[PDB]
Every structure is written in C-alpha cells, then in structure tokens.
Amino acid sequence: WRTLVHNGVALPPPYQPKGLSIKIRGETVKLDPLQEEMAYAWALKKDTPYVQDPVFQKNFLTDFLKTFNGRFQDVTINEIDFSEVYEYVERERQLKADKEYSAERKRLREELKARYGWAEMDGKRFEIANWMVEPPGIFMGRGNHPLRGRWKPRVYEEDITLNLGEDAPVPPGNWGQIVHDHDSMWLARWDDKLTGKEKYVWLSDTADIKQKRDKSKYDKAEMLENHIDRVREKIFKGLRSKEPKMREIALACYLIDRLAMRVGDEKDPDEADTVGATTLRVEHVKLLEDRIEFDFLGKDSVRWQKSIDLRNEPPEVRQVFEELLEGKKEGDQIFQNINSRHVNRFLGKIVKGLTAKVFRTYIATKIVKDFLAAIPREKVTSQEKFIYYAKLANLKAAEALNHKRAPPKNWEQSIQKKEERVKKLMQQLREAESEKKKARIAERLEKAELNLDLAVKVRDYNLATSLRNYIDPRVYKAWGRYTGYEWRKIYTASLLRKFKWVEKASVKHVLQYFAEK
Amino acid sequence: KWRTLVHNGVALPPPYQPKGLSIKIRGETVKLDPLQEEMAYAWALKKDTPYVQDPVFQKNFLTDFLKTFNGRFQDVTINEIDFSEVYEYVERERQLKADKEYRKKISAERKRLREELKARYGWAEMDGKRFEIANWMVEPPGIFMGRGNHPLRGRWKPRVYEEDITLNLGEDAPVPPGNWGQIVHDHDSMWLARWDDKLTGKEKYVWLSDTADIKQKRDKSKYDKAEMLENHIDRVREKIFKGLRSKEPKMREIALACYLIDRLAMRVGDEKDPDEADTVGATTLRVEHVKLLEDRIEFDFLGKDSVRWQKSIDLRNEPPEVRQVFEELLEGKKEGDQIFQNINSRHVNRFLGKIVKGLTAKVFRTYIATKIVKDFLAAIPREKVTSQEKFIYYAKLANLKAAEALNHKRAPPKNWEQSIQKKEERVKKLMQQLREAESEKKKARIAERLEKAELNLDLAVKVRDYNLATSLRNYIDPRVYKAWGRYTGYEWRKIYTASLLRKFKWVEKASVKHVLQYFAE
Ligand SMILES: [Cl-]
Ligand SMILES: [Cl-]
Ligand SMILES: [Cl-]
Ligand SMILES: [Cl-]
Ligand SMILES: [Cl-]
Ligand SMILES: [Cl-]
Ligand SMILES: [Cl-]
Ligand SMILES: [Cl-]
Ligand SMILES: [Cl-]
Ligand SMILES: [Cl-]
Ligand SMILES: [Cl-]
Ligand SMILES: [Cl-]
C-alpha cells in the first residue's frame, strides 16, 4: 500500500466497581476493583459447565488468589461463597429483560462505529473488521485448552502499535509505537498478555479475516460436542414451556437436531430451494400414531421425504406439532412465528455463539467422522479407495442435511457409459499378459468400478454444499493422517484456498477418535 | 510467470534384473516371477532390521506381495514363507562386496557415469538462465517407510514410468525423448515434472535447487531422519562397537570417531562453518588433549580465546574395544600429534550410512540435541509454566542443555561482568518502582517488566560460557518447541528470530503428535 489512515482501535471501557463482597470460609471479604472484576466474570459463568471443570477452576484461582496479598493461597472454589456476586448478576439480568425502553445507545454505538470502523487506503474507504479491543475476561478455547480459566489481562494503548502512512495524522492515544510498514496489511498489533500470541487488526473483506471467521465456525461446532446433551435437554424443556412462542421456537430447534433442517429464511442459493422449517406447510406433514412423515416438493421439482419414528421420542414433540397444525388449512405455513433471529437467540442462551448454522455444521461433521471411524483401516487399500470412502461420508452428510437435487440431466446414459467403461476395461486387461500392462489396466479398472458405484449413489444429492460449508476439513486432514493417503485430493483448488487454515491446524481432536480401536 | 522453460525431463530408474530365485510357502517351492522376486528381494534386504518384526509392516508388505499370486496363497501369513534362499543370495552378494568397491573397477567408471547422467538431466534453462535441477532422479520402487509409525509402512511403492509423468515446458521448447504422459506449458507453475505417487497418492514434483520448496524439504528431511534414529539407536551403537572390532584399521578409527559422536556429541572436526569451527572435534584432538586412565578416558581441550572444554567417559562398563582402539591410535605418537589422522566427514558418513541409510554425523547430533531438549521440557510440571516469559525461559534453559551437550562452549562475552551488574541494578530499581506503584495499570505494567528482568538475569548468568544459537538453528527439531507451545498453551514462535521462523516454516504444517504424546504421558 501507498497511503493508509485510520483512527486506531477502540479500547474497552474501564470496569465499574459495585462494592460487592464474597465469603471465604465464612469470612466476609470486601472485593477490590480488580478482584471484583474477576469475581464478576466468574459469576457471569455461574450457570455454565466450565465452572465445574477442575482445570478451569484451578487456572482461574491462579490469577484470582494472587490478588489477596498472600492470604487464601490454599483456598479452592468450593470454599468461596460468590452468592452476593451471583445475586447482582441475576438482578442485572432481570433488569435487562425488563427495560423495554432509553435507546440512545444507538447514537453511542453508531458514534463509535463511525469513529473507529473505517480506514482509508490509497484513497479508498475500507471497513475495519476488529477495531474493538476486547475487554479482559476469562480465557476459553475449544474445550481442552491448557490455559482455560486463566485471566486475560487488560490491554492498554501503550501495548498497541499502529500501522499508518507517514503523512497520516497520528490519532489520539498513548500508542506504544506508530510503524510505517508499507509492506504489511495489518492496522494495529499487540501481544496477548496471557498466551503471548500476536493480535492483529485487519480490514474487512481480507484473506486473514475470512480465514479467521471460517475457522471460528468449525471451532464452535467442535465445542458443541461438549454441550449437545444439554442443548437437547433445553430444546425438550422448551417444548414443554407454558409460552407458545417458546414452544414453536423449540420445535424448530428440535427439527435442526433431528432432521438437520435449516430454519428456512437463509437466502444462499446453494440451499434456498431445500426444505426448511419456515417453508413447511400443513400438507407437507402427516402425524400418525407411530411416526411423523414429511413430504416436501420444492421449486426445482425435487421431492424430499423423511420420517421420524415417534416410538422413543418425548411426547411433547407430537404435542407441539398438533398445537401448530390445529385449525389450519392444508396450504397454511406451519411455523409462522419463526426466523433465524428467534432460533439463534434461543440456541445462544444455551451455548453462547451457537446458531443453526453451527448446529448443522456439528451434525454434518459428526456424521462424516462417525462414518469414517467405522471403516477398518485394512479396508483402505489405495488412494482411490480412500477417496471413495471420503465421498460416501460426504454423501451421508448431504442426505442428512437435506441437500437433495434434481438428477444430472444425462445421468441415465452416463451411468451406462461408466458401465460400458467398466465392461470394456474389464476384459481389456484379460487379454494382456504383460504385467506392466496388466497392472496399469488394473489401476483404472478399480478407479472405474469405484467411480461407478459412487455415481449411482450420489445421483440425488449435492455433496458440494456440505463439503464447502458444513464439514470441518480437519476431519478429512485427520483421515488422511490416520490412513496415510492424500486428503487434499478430496478438495477442489477453490476449497483448498478456503480451507488454507487447515494446513496449520491441529487435528488431534479427530485423529484421537479414529485411533481409538 | 516464467517466459521460457527448457529441460530434459527426468531420469527413470533402471529395470529390475531377475535372479531366478525361489521361496517356500508351506514347504512348497514356488518360483518367483520378476515382480514377486523384486519384492521378495527388498524384504530380504531388511532381514536383519526391526521392520520385518513389526506386525503392521508385515501385514502391509503381505498385502501387496500376496496380490501377485492372484489365485493361490491369498490366506498366507508371514511365518508360512521361507525366504532363506533369497536371504542366502543377499548374504552372498554382500559378502562379495566385502572385497573391492572403492577401487578403480567401481571408482572412476561409477564416477564417470554419475557425472554423465547429471550432465544430461541436472540443468534447466529458465528465461535464458541456467539453473540446477534438484531432484531429477525418479526413485526406484521399494518398500515404503516413514518416520517409524506411518500407517502404510511395509507397503510396496510401485514403479513409475515415463507414461506416468507430466513435464512442464515452454510452448516451443524441445520435447525431450521419452513417452511422457503429458506435456503442459504452465507459466504459473515453477515445477518441471509431476506425477502421482502410486502408493500414497501424494503429487510428486521436480524443482530447481534454488527454490523454497527444495530448501524446506531438505531442512525437514534432516530432522525426520533424526526422529527415525530414535527407534534404531541401540542397533546403531552395536554396529559402532562392531566397527571397533573390525580387522581393517581404517574402519576401526572411523568407528571410534562415531563412538565419540554418540558418547560426547563430538563433531567430526572438518566442517568449515564458523559456527562450530572453534569447538572441539575428533580431528582437532591431539595426544595432550586425551588422558587414558585405568577405568576412564578424560578429554581436556584448550581452544580459541583460551577456552577449555573438558569431558570424560567412564570405561568400566564400556566394551573393551573402546580402550583397545584408543591405545592403538595413541601408540607411537607424542605430544603435538593428531590422534585421528584418517578421518573426515565423508568416511564417517559412509560408515554411518551403511548402518542406517541417510544417517550422518549432523543427523546423529540432531537426534542427541533434540532428545536432550525433549527430556528437559518433559520433566517440567505444567504448574511451573506460569506465563509466556516463564515458557520462553524454560525453552532457553533446554536450549542451553543442548549447547552443553554438543560442546558449543565459548569465551564469556566481552563485558559480561558489567552487563551482569547492570541487570542486577535494573531488577533492584524495578522492585522499588513496584513497591511505590499506585494504580492497578501501573502495578501490573511493572510486574510484567520485573518478571522479565529477573528471568533474563538468571539466563544471562547461566548461558555465559555457551552459544545457544548454534543448536537452536541446526540441531534441535523445531517440532519440539511447537509441541511445547501446544502442551502449555503459550506462543512458541517467540523462541525464534524472524530468520529461524523462515527456515522452520515447514513446522507450521507438520504434525507434532510424536513429541506431544511424550509430553502428555
Ligand atoms: Cl470490532
Ligand atoms: Cl478450552
Ligand atoms: Cl466447551
Ligand atoms: Cl489505555
Ligand atoms: Cl436457512
Ligand atoms: Cl428465546
Ligand atoms: Cl497432512
Ligand atoms: Cl522419486
Ligand atoms: Cl514408518
Ligand atoms: Cl565438523
Ligand atoms: Cl507432518
Ligand atoms: Cl497429526
């Protein structure tokens, strides 16, 4: 770049003390501001599973107990009474759900965005992706990070170096450095004060930000594995709720869990014609004694059918379906009060960051993992067999996520052509005694035989949708490492660029699952 | 975009020469066709290695081997096969090699043909400039192996042919002789040739020597060989002892130099690189540097800047051939005489490579230094790694242990004594600035810098006599430090300068499971 101007980064607001106390072994202790700021972060997690994790507890106390001037060094979490801090949190939670409004925050939120959210690079205006420096808080990763529960210390202007053009105005701030690095694209830089990792501020719509955001989705899905039981319990509790809006939302979430059905309002053309909760009409659903049948004919003339065996489903499932169908005509929409905002608000209250898209990524990724884990390594005899199994796993995820498609236009004859190719190769090598020739015919035979079986199996399904969007590429990198074969050949050049981040990423989480025996 | 690109393609392996050998399966003599014999002979070449005792290696090998007998024997297990006839041919041919190869029958002529093939295939022209091609030989087929735990170990690597190979050439470059599978003109690609590995499915590329692709591949290869040595160090040591008992005195001297690699991590001594040229090495030892006592041997080397290096080996549990060869080399020499007069890296690496293909003095000392670092970090409780700066501190103390092990001893820095006092004052001041600290922001900013000052002071004292950079750049597998970062959660990239992060760029993609499993034990 030639010139680059921006207003730096927005630092978090200081913590506001509330005069709260805790009890340690019966002794009331008045919290200092930093003590209270940490006790408050812990309290905000009071209803999460993390505060029951002994590694999480020990890491938190490592930073917490250091603030007590030498006292309480051998205290454990069970000997601290946080109830005063919990009560403040619950009170603020109730107050936040009661102030239906003082909407002058939009002027203040918009004022920050206009001030810090835009950089001007070589005369052009560009949005900044991450201009807010996050406030201090408790560190968390995907579930097994060794530093989980440790405090992330507050970052100040002096820790931050800004990248600016030489003729740009130095924005207000006690910055630690202003560098004129025409070579590098980043806007601001600083070291994370817990992990030692370098933190960068990038323009929106850049390679670094999209790779980060792409990987973050699959990371949330991996984390979901730790919480899926609780999610399912809260979906069913929602179905039993007294509030009809809650029952309807919970039922849409039940359909995500059970059928991997999308919400129905996403506009992306890859899935816009597939079934979704909001496009279900009364005529698409039949409630029977032992099952619920779904039968949906889409715009593309694709008929999608699945059923749910009610034998071992909770009774509240049929109860809410009956409630929503009651009194409606066959052409009426079933889910008339649903959209992605309501669904993701419900899910997000169970697991922060959880959305329907993350949920379906977890589903598709688990299906692929479980399919491949069931294959004895001795059956994976070649690169072609490796690809074949990878694709059958992709197909299982496609059918699970309802990525049904109209058959390829000339599928009928192309199968005979693959059947012809198999036939012709079949005895082409039967009349060739040279083993160098009888070997390079054997190789294309199995490639053709596997490619034929695959071509029959994939006719009605678009595998690309889940391969591009819902299957964690770490599963296929791990499958490559587990078996020895070339997993990059599962992907187009385009998807290899999209998943460039997988090259550096650990696959221990998946590979340990394959290697269990 | 290159504009023109000219080369002669790649050199294909020589065809296998059948020998008319047979094996026995369940007592039935079976005559081997060419491919079966080729595979049986490869297996026989490993008859005295651990690999042929590994059930995974066996199953993989039998998967491809039994496939050659298309109807019969599809049920056979490895113990039902009698390879003794192939074993005998191998032993006969290797005993035959115990007479003359480094003579003129296989010296000048072997040399001449080697240079002839290099002149034919080793050079490309790109945009009118001539460049050496790094890997113009297609490797012959054989039994696949990785670093020790590869899932395809024991599988056959099938022969590659001209018809399998794509060449990348300018549109109007001459088409080199050969039945190439395809000629492309891809101005966006720097590779010269490409084919699929017929076992692993990985795409194989031919590159110019001056590429990142080759530099990175050669850098990682050294550390991979050192990782693989971990499984074989006992056998290597026994073959060193065996060399010490050889009847040829030149092999005995070479063996003793290799023994000093193993026991003291002592370099050969002939490498010109200034990083190590002033440290002790086998070829730099003189009679007065070595005291042979009754149950131990003491080394006392006085080098540049009056730096004295001293280490000793306890001999009482050592095999007597160690003392034997030392006495042999010391006898008839007086003060000032060089002990190892027929030693260089070529002879040493020839000897080591006969034990393990690709093994060299540098690979051996990389294994030593890497194990030292791994063992040091593995013994550290996670509770002690309390911060990024503590993490870096322990990493450097491990680095120092490898420096001491590999004899990278140096004279203390010019102003060390005063550069130690100055840090003692800066910590003294830093503590008083933190007692009078006020705001939380201030109490933490000084705490940050104080902890850094105290650790750096203790480091500065401990590293006075050793150059840590040599082993960090050359002998410590960076996967150890990446794994240390993953085990603890801290940023391992700060262990490295920008230069070393470039050299070790390959570690970003590399698995560290082999080391991390050891830390997580
Ligand atoms: Cl932001
Ligand atoms: Cl975590
Ligand atoms: Cl979690
Ligand atoms: Cl600040
Ligand atoms: Cl949707
Ligand atoms: Cl809700
Ligand atoms: Cl890989
Ligand atoms: Cl090769
Ligand atoms: Cl291996
Ligand atoms: Cl040397
Ligand atoms: Cl690797
Ligand atoms: Cl791995």
Numbering used by the authors:
A (entry chain B): 4 to 104, 109 to 524
B (entry chain A): 3 to 523
Authors' text:
We solved the crystal structure of both selenomethionine-labelled (SeMet) CsTOP1 and native CsTOP1 at 2.0 and 2.20 Å, respectively. In both cases, the asymmetric unit of the crystal contained two TOP1 molecules. In the asymmetric unit, each TOP1 molecule folds similarly, and there is no significant difference between SeMet CsTOP1 and native CsTOP1. In its apo-form, CsTOP1 folds as a compact protein, comprised of the CAP region (1–207), the CAT region (208–412), the linker (413–469), and the C-terminal region (469–524). The electron density of the C-terminal extremity of CsTOP1 (525–539) is not visible in these crystal structures, suggesting that this region, which is poorly conserved in other archaea, is flexible. The enzyme displays an open conformation resulting from one substantial rotation between the capping (CAP) and the catalytic (CAT) modules. In the apo-form structure, the TOP1 CAP domain does not block access of the DNA molecule to the DNA interacting region. The Lip2 loop segment moves towards this region and partially covers it. More precisely, the side chain of glutamate Glu278 (Lip2) forms hydrogen bonds with the Nε atom of His410 and the hydroxyl group of Tyr477. Therefore, while the DNA cavity is not blocked by the presence of the CAP domain in the CsTOP1 open-conformation, the Lip2 loop interaction with the catalytic tetrad may hinder the entry of the DNA molecule, and its displacement seems necessary for DNA binding.
Type IB topoisomerases (Topo IB) are found in all eukaryotes (where they are referred to as TOP1), in several archaeal phyla, several bacterial genera and several groups of viruses. TOP1, also known as swivelase or untwisting enzyme, can relax both positive and negative supercoils by nicking DNA, enabling the rotation of the broken DNA strand around the complementary intact strand of the DNA duplex and catalyzing the closing of the nick. In particular, one topoisomerase from the hyperthermophilic archaeon Caldiarchaeum subterraneum (CsTOP1) was found to be highly similar to human TOP1 (34% sequence identity, 53% similarity) and to display similar activity, while being extremely stable. Here, we solved the structure of thermostable archaeal Caldiarchaeum subterraneum CsTOP1 in an apo-form.
